[PDB]
DNA sequence: ATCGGATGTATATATCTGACACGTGCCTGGAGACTAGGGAGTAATCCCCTTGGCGGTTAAAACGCGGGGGACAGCGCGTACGTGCGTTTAAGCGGTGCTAGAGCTGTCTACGACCAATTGAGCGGCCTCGGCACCGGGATTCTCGA
DNA sequence: TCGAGAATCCCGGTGCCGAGGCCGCTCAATTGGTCGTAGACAGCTCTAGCACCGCTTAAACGCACGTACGCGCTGTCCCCCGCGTTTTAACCGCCAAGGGGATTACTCCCTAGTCTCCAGGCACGTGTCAGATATATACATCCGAT
C-alpha cells in the first residue's frame, strides 16, 4: 500500500495535489474534476520551462551563471509570444530593451 | 568640448543598459507619505511597499516618455514638449 | 505620524532625475517646460495608487501599508507588478 | 508561518532545462509571482466558462479551453499538447 | 362622369349582410355542403351565423356592339359567365389557358359594367410589370372611350400622377404592377375599388405574402382573378385563391385541407372529388386549350432514362456518404459532375471531348442534337441551373453550334434582341439556351419545334409553362419533348413527386373543364 | 423558458424619478446589462477582498469597501450613504 | 405570520432576495452575510436612478418622452464620473458627442 | 469559351467601400482624408475582426454548439476588454 | 456659371450630420460576407445569427470611429488637417495594439 | 583627409555574501470505503437554416474632371536648449534606542447553513392605443461671388 | 462689400407598431426551528517601523557661452474635394424541399465529495564556498578638431 504522488503518476514536476487544493479552496466552482489539476500543472510547468530556457540563454549570452530579473526581462521582451502574454506586467529590477530611434542618430 | 547630442546619446545608451532606480529614495518616500496623509492620518509604511511604489512609478514614467518621444518624432522634431505628453496621455486614455 | 508634516515635496522629484527617466525612455533633447508636466502626471498616478492601497489597508483594520496592499492596488488599476509577493 | 511557494519546483525544472545555471532570490520571487498570476488567470477563465455553460464542475476540457483562449498561438498549441499528454499518461496508470 | 363629379363616387369620404343575404340565397340553391363552412364558423365565429339561421337573366347572345371588332363565341360564353357571376354578388376565377385570350374577355366585361349598368370605374388592375403595356393597348383598342394610366415610374413621376389624376379622380382603370401595389397602398387604399382584377394570380398563393396582406386591407365591392393554371402543387393554394375571392365563405383552411388533402377518405376513391366538382362548379371556369384551336398538334413527350458515368457514380457515392449542406448536391451530381470544384481535370483546362463522356446525360444529349442537326431542327434546352447552363454553353462551343442564351441575369433589351434574332427568318441559330423559370410569359419561341427539358422541376406547372414556349399558337409542325431522367437517383424521386402532383391537378381541375 | 432581468425594478426606479416618461426595449436591455455588469464588478471585488483577508463570508463591510474601490470619486460617497441608510433601516425594522 | 419582502423591509425597490440568491450562487465566497444583499441592492438602485435621471433630462431636452440608447449615451458621456465609470463600455445604437476640433473650423 | 471558371468575387474586404470608410471618418470628425487611408483601414479592420472571431469560435466550440451566438460575441469582446451593452 | 461650395464646407456639414445620427454606417450584407469569410478560417462548417453579426458590427464600427478620432488628433498635432497612414500607425502603436 | 583626448572595454586580483546542500517536524497529500447527484446518453420535435434560381426599386458606389488649397520643401534667424565648471547640499550609510502594533492562541457565542410548508411576486401570453417616424411647404439661416 | 441660392429647421398631418397594462400560474422568497463553527474579543509577544545623529561625498544648482533647431515666411505643385453621369448591388418579395441543430424530458451510472488514518514531502533553520562585485590597469575606439 505504498503511496506514490499524482505528479509521479503523470510524469510531471509541479505538484498536482497542491494545485487540486488551490482549485478547491479558491472558490472557482462547486466541484473540481480529477484531470483538471493534472492538465493545469502540466501547462504551468511548460510555461515555466519555456520562459526559463530563454532566461538561461540570455544569462549565458551575458556571461553569467545565476539568472537575474534583468535576464528574465530580456527573455520576455525579446520573445514575442511571451511579450504579448506579459504585456501589462512590469518586472521589478528589470529595465528596457536597448532601442534608439533612427532619426536621433547622427548622420 | 563635445557637440550637442553626443553626451545625450551616451546617456541614452548608459541608462538603457542599467537596471537601478533613477529617483533618489528619501525624496520619493517623503512625497509618498505626504500624499498618503490626505486619505488617513498617522499611517506607517513598509519599506517594501515604498520600493514597490517607486518601481511602479518609474516604469510608468519611462513608458510614458517613450510614447512622448514617438509623438515628438511624428511632428518632425527631436525635442519633447508638454503638448506631446498631453497627446500621449489623451490617446492612451489616461486623460 | 506627528513628524512636522511637510509640503512641496513634489520638488524633490528633481530635474536631473526627470532627465534620467527621459534618457532611459530614449529621449535626446528635452524642452524646459516638461518638468512641471512630469511632476503633475507623477503626482496624479501616485495619488490614485496610494488611495487604493490605503483603502485596502484600512479595510484590513491595519495602520501599516504593506507591499501586498500596494501590489493589489496596482493589479486593480491594471499594472501588475512582479517581485514583491502575490 | 509556513508560507507556500513554487520555488522547490521551479528549481527542479531549471536544473533540467539548464543543469548548470542557478537563480537569484529576486528572480525566484518573480517566477513564483508569474506562476501564481498565470494560475489565477487560467482558473478564473475556466470558472467563468463553467458558469457560462451552466456546468457545476471544472474539468480538463474547461482547462484546455481556457489555455487555448488565454495563450497566443504557438504557446497555446504547445501547452495544449503537453496538457493532453500528461492527462493521458495519468489516466493510463 | 366629370372628374370633380366623379370624385363624389370614387374617393372613400366616409358584418356586411346586405349583399351576404343575396349571396347565400343564390349559393345554397346548390348542394347543402356549401353551408358546412358557415355551420363550422358559426360556433367558431358567432357573428356570421345571423344570415344562415334566418334561412336578372341576360344571356347576352351576340358579341358586344360597343366593342371594336368581332368577339369569338367561346369568349362570348365566358363574358356571359362573368355577367352571371356579377349579377349574383359572388366572384369567380377565369382559368383559360395561356394565349387563349383573357384580357379581351375581362375588358369586354368591364365595358359591360360601364355601358349596361353605368358605373365608370373605379377599377384596379394588377398584373406583372411586363404585361402592363399589353393591357393598355387592348384597353385603348377594343373600347377606345375610356381613360387609363399605367401608374409607373420613379417616386416623383408616380406622385405626380397620383396628385394629377388619382386624387383628382380623372380615370377609369388604374393598371399597376405587383410591386406598385405594395409600394403605394396609402394613396391607393381609398378609391372604393368597384373591382380588383389580378392577371396571373399564381403570385397570390401564400396567405403570408406581403401582396396578400396588402390586398386584404383594400375595400372593394367585388373581386376577380385571372390565372392560367390554379393549383400548381398543393390544394391549400387553391383554398387561398378561393379565400381571397370570398372570405365570407372560404374562411377555414383546415376545413378544406382535412376535407380532401390533409385527409383523403379511406374509401375506394372519387367521392370527395365528386363533392369538389359540385363545390367549385359555380366558382371556377376553365376551358380546354384544344377545345377550339385545332392547329397546335399535341406534344410527343418522351423520357430518356440515362444511366450514370464512372466519375459521376464516384461523386454521387461520395455525396451520399457522410462542406456540402443540402440534398440538392445529389441533383447537381446527377446533372453534371463538373459543377463541383475540383472535378474538372487539372489546373490547365481544355474543351475537348473530355466533358461529353464524363457526364451521363450529355452523351445522349449530344447524340440527339447531332441526329436532329442532320435533320433540320432547333433546340430549346431548359435546364434548372444557370451555372450548369454555362457548361452546356462551353460544350456547344466545342461542337461549334450557335448560342442564343437568356438566363435570369440577361438584361431586358438583350432578352428582346435575342428573341428577335432567333425568331427572325432563316438564321444561323441552332440551340437556344434558357432557364425554365425565366422571362415570365413574354416569350414567343414559335419558330423551333424541339424542346429538351434537361432537368425536371418540383412542380409540373413550371415545366408545362416552359414547354408552352414552343407549343403556343403559332408553331404548327411537331413538338418533341425530351426530358432527361437519370435512374437510381434522387431525380427519380423528384420525377415521381412531380407526377403525383400532376395527377392531383388532373383529377381536381382537369375534370371540370370536360364538363365546361 | 423563464428568463429573469431587472426590468420591472428599473422601471419602478424610473417612475419615481421621471413620473411621466417611458423607455424603449433597447434602452431597457442596455440598463439590464449595466446593472448586471456593475453587480459582477462589485461582487468580484468583494470576493477577492474577502479572499485576501482569509475570511469566508462576504458582508456589508466587504461590499462597502468594494464600492469605495470601484466607484469614481464623488459618486462613491452617495452610494455608501445610501447603502448604510438601507442597512440601518433594514436592521432596525 | 404574514410575509414581508426584505426589499420593503429595507425600503428599497430592487430585489434583495434575488440579489442574495445570485450572491450565493455566483461562487464568490463560502458564506454571505445578512446586510450584504441590502447594501448591494441599495447601491444598484442609486446608480440606476442617477443614470436614468440624466437620461430623462436628455430625452426631455430632445423633446421626447422615451429614453433611447442615444439619450443613455448622451447622458453617460456628458457626466465626467459616470463616463469614467463606463470608460471601456460601448453602448449599442449610441453614437458620439458632437465635437469638432477648433482648427478644422473655417477662418 | 471556358466559362465554367466563372469569377473571382474580388474581395469581401474590398466590400468595405471607400464611401463607408469616409462615413466612419466623418463620424470620427476628420475633414480631409488621404488616398492611402482606405487600405490601412481595411487592414486594421480585418485584424480586429479575426481577433474577436477567434475567441467567439472558441467559446462556441467549447459549448459543443455549431452556431456562434450574440452571447459568444459579447463574451469575446468582454475578454478583449471591449464590453458591449445592448445584446445581453 | 453654377455656384460651387468651397472645399471643406461640405466636409464640415457631413461631419456635423454624422456626429448626430446613430445608425450603422457600413452596409449589412458586405459586412456579413466578410465575417463569414474570416470565420471559415478557424473552423469550417459554422453558422451565425443575425444578432451575433449585428453585435460584431456594432463593436467594429465603434472601434473604427474611436480610432479615427485619435488619428485626427495625431494629424492636428503634426500641423496638418489631412489624416495619413502614419497617423493611424502612431495612434495604434501608442494605444498598445501594435 | 590625420592627430589628441576622452570613454568604454577586457584582464587580474581580493572580498564578501547569498545560493545551495543538509538535517529535523509536522502538516498535508494519498489510500480506502461509502454515497448521492451531476452529467451523459436517448429520444421527440420543430423551427429555422441551406442551395439554387427568379423579378424589380432605388439609392449608393464608381468614375471623370476642374481647380483650389494644402503638403512639402527651402531659407533665415534668434532664441532656447546642450555642455562644462565650481559650489553647496542633501542622500546614503552605519548605529542605536523605543515602542506601536502586526501576528498568534483560546473561548464562546451569535449568526449563517440547512430543511420543511406556505404563498405572494414575477414572468409568459395577449391586446390596444399613443409616441415617434415620415412627408410636404414655408421660413429662416448661412455661404459665396458681386 | 449685399443679394442670390441651398440647406436646414420648424410646423402640421398621417399611420403603425411596440410599451405598457391585465391576467393566470408556479416557483423561488419567507417563516420558523435546529445546529455547528467562523469571527470577535482578550491577552501576549516580539518584530519591524520610526526617530535621531554623525560623516562622506556624489549629485544638484547656478551660471557662462555658443550652436542648431524650432518656427515663421514664401513658392510650387499635386492631389483631394465638390459635382454631374451612369452602373450596379443591396434589399426586398418569392419558390421548392428537406433536414439539422437547439431544446426539453427522463433514466441511470460513476465520479465527485466526505470521513478516517498515516506516512513522507516540504517548509524552516543552519552552515559552507564560489559567483558576483569592487578596484586597478592597459588597450581600442570613436569624436572633434585640425
Ligand atoms: N378580335 C379578336 N377576338 C378574339 N381574340 C383576339 C382578337 N384580337 C386579338 N385577340 C387575341 O386576344 C389575345 C389576348 O391574350 P393574351 O394577350 O395572350 O393574354 P392571355 O394569355 O392572358 O389571354 C391576344 O393574344 C390576341 O391575339
Ligand atoms: Mg396573358
XYZ file of N, CA and C in Angstrom, chain H residues 4-84:
243
model
N -16.882 27.909 -67.303
C -17.081 27.153 -66.069
C -16.190 27.616 -64.922
N -15.457 28.707 -65.124
C -14.481 29.209 -64.170
C -14.888 30.622 -63.767
N -16.156 30.766 -63.381
C -16.954 31.980 -63.524
C -16.251 33.291 -63.191
N -15.940 33.525 -61.919
C -15.472 34.836 -61.480
C -14.511 34.677 -60.312
N -14.072 35.821 -59.788
C -13.137 35.883 -58.673
C -13.868 36.331 -57.414
N -14.902 37.165 -57.573
C -15.623 37.749 -56.440
C -14.657 38.556 -55.563
N -14.239 39.692 -56.128
C -12.942 40.318 -55.885
C -12.419 40.194 -54.456
N -13.125 40.723 -53.457
C -12.701 40.510 -52.080
C -13.761 41.055 -51.137
N -14.078 40.270 -50.109
C -15.030 40.737 -49.114
C -14.466 41.893 -48.300
N -13.141 41.976 -48.161
C -12.555 43.150 -47.523
C -12.714 44.372 -48.419
N -12.619 44.186 -49.739
C -12.928 45.266 -50.666
C -14.411 45.592 -50.674
N -15.243 44.708 -50.128
C -16.639 45.044 -49.918
C -16.853 46.214 -48.978
N -15.852 46.555 -48.170
C -15.911 47.722 -47.289
C -15.543 48.935 -48.137
N -16.551 49.676 -48.580
C -16.362 50.640 -49.651
C -15.707 51.921 -49.157
N -14.985 52.564 -50.070
C -14.388 53.865 -49.794
C -15.382 54.880 -49.243
N -16.609 55.005 -49.759
C -17.591 55.851 -49.068
C -17.882 55.408 -47.647
N -17.830 54.108 -47.351
C -18.093 53.654 -45.988
C -16.977 54.076 -45.038
N -15.721 53.885 -45.448
C -14.622 54.406 -44.634
C -14.739 55.917 -44.488
N -15.151 56.609 -45.552
C -15.305 58.057 -45.465
C -16.384 58.446 -44.461
N -17.490 57.703 -44.428
C -18.559 57.986 -43.476
C -18.093 57.769 -42.044
N -17.395 56.658 -41.801
C -16.857 56.415 -40.465
C -15.872 57.507 -40.073
N -15.073 57.971 -41.031
C -14.135 59.052 -40.769
C -14.861 60.343 -40.420
N -15.953 60.642 -41.124
C -16.735 61.832 -40.804
C -17.323 61.749 -39.405
N -17.844 60.583 -39.022
C -18.340 60.442 -37.656
C -17.212 60.609 -36.649
N -16.014 60.133 -36.988
C -14.859 60.403 -36.154
C -14.486 61.867 -36.087
N -14.826 62.638 -37.110
C -14.619 64.065 -37.104
C -13.442 64.578 -37.901
N -13.059 63.906 -38.983
C -11.919 64.328 -39.786
C -12.437 65.099 -40.990
N -11.616 66.021 -41.488
C -12.008 66.892 -42.591
C -11.485 66.386 -43.931
N -10.176 66.198 -44.053
C -9.561 65.721 -45.283
C -8.952 64.345 -45.060
N -9.166 63.450 -46.020
C -8.721 62.066 -45.934
C -7.743 61.800 -47.066
N -6.562 61.298 -46.722
C -5.583 60.937 -47.733
C -6.045 59.707 -48.509
N -5.499 59.554 -49.716
C -5.933 58.480 -50.589
C -5.488 57.102 -50.152
N -4.489 57.017 -49.282
C -3.956 55.740 -48.830
C -4.593 55.256 -47.536
N -5.540 56.012 -46.983
C -6.162 55.641 -45.718
C -7.030 54.401 -45.882
N -7.607 54.212 -47.068
C -8.619 53.188 -47.281
C -8.058 51.775 -47.282
N -6.745 51.599 -47.395
C -6.148 50.274 -47.282
C -5.692 49.962 -45.866
N -5.114 50.947 -45.179
C -4.782 50.771 -43.774
C -6.030 50.486 -42.952
N -7.133 51.171 -43.268
C -8.378 50.933 -42.546
C -8.856 49.501 -42.733
N -8.796 48.993 -43.963
C -9.209 47.617 -44.206
C -8.311 46.635 -43.470
N -7.004 46.899 -43.449
C -6.104 46.013 -42.729
C -6.417 45.945 -41.245
N -6.590 47.107 -40.613
C -6.842 47.111 -39.174
C -8.208 46.504 -38.871
N -9.189 46.741 -39.746
C -10.499 46.125 -39.578
C -10.411 44.608 -39.626
N -9.673 44.070 -40.597
C -9.540 42.622 -40.685
C -8.842 42.063 -39.459
N -7.796 42.742 -38.982
C -7.076 42.253 -37.806
C -8.008 42.187 -36.601
N -8.761 43.262 -36.365
C -9.681 43.288 -35.231
C -10.736 42.196 -35.350
N -11.288 42.020 -36.552
C -12.335 41.027 -36.740
C -11.824 39.618 -36.487
N -10.631 39.284 -36.988
C -10.088 37.959 -36.698
C -9.846 37.774 -35.210
N -9.323 38.802 -34.536
C -9.060 38.659 -33.107
C -10.336 38.362 -32.332
N -11.437 39.032 -32.671
C -12.680 38.784 -31.940
C -13.292 37.441 -32.332
N -13.291 37.129 -33.629
C -13.956 35.925 -34.109
C -13.255 34.675 -33.604
N -11.934 34.721 -33.428
C -11.236 33.554 -32.899
C -11.778 33.168 -31.528
N -11.936 34.148 -30.639
C -12.446 33.856 -29.304
C -13.917 33.462 -29.342
N -14.709 34.090 -30.212
C -16.110 33.694 -30.308
C -16.239 32.240 -30.748
N -15.436 31.834 -31.731
C -15.457 30.455 -32.195
C -14.950 29.517 -31.110
N -13.970 29.956 -30.320
C -13.506 29.127 -29.211
C -14.630 28.871 -28.214
N -15.372 29.921 -27.859
C -16.480 29.761 -26.924
C -17.532 28.809 -27.479
N -17.921 29.003 -28.741
C -18.967 28.152 -29.296
C -18.483 26.731 -29.554
N -17.173 26.522 -29.696
C -16.642 25.169 -29.775
C -16.689 24.491 -28.418
N -16.339 25.226 -27.362
C -16.406 24.655 -26.024
C -17.832 24.280 -25.656
N -18.797 25.122 -26.019
C -20.181 24.802 -25.694
C -20.730 23.633 -26.503
N -19.944 23.072 -27.424
C -20.375 21.987 -28.307
C -21.582 22.377 -29.149
N -21.693 23.652 -29.495
C -22.685 24.103 -30.451
C -22.041 24.239 -31.823
N -22.847 24.660 -32.795
C -22.371 24.885 -34.151
C -22.863 26.220 -34.691
N -23.291 27.118 -33.808
C -23.849 28.411 -34.193
C -23.299 29.466 -33.246
N -22.499 30.390 -33.776
C -21.998 31.493 -32.969
C -23.162 32.386 -32.571
N -23.233 32.727 -31.292
C -24.340 33.498 -30.752
C -23.878 34.879 -30.309
N -24.858 35.776 -30.183
C -24.576 37.109 -29.669
C -23.933 37.042 -28.297
N -24.310 36.054 -27.484
C -23.665 35.883 -26.189
C -22.196 35.530 -26.347
N -21.869 34.672 -27.314
C -20.471 34.329 -27.549
C -19.678 35.543 -28.000
N -20.261 36.354 -28.880
C -19.575 37.560 -29.335
C -19.371 38.528 -28.177
N -20.391 38.687 -27.332
C -20.289 39.578 -26.181
C -19.209 39.094 -25.226
N -19.153 37.784 -24.982
C -18.124 37.237 -24.108
C -16.734 37.461 -24.683
N -16.573 37.277 -25.994
C -15.273 37.522 -26.611
C -14.861 38.983 -26.473
N -15.798 39.903 -26.708
C -15.490 41.320 -26.556
C -15.116 41.650 -25.118
N -15.855 41.102 -24.153
C -15.529 41.329 -22.750
C -14.146 40.795 -22.414
N -13.800 39.623 -22.945
C -12.470 39.070 -22.719
C -11.395 39.991 -23.277
N -11.619 40.546 -24.467
C -10.661 41.506 -25.005
C -10.716 42.858 -24.307
N -11.717 43.100 -23.468
C -11.802 44.355 -22.748
C -12.548 45.423 -23.518
N -13.633 45.028 -24.173
C -14.427 45.923 -25.004
C -15.910 45.700 -24.735
N -16.286 45.732 -23.457
C -17.650 45.464 -23.011
C -18.684 46.165 -23.884
N -19.718 45.423 -24.270
C -20.752 45.908 -25.176
C -22.110 45.760 -24.507
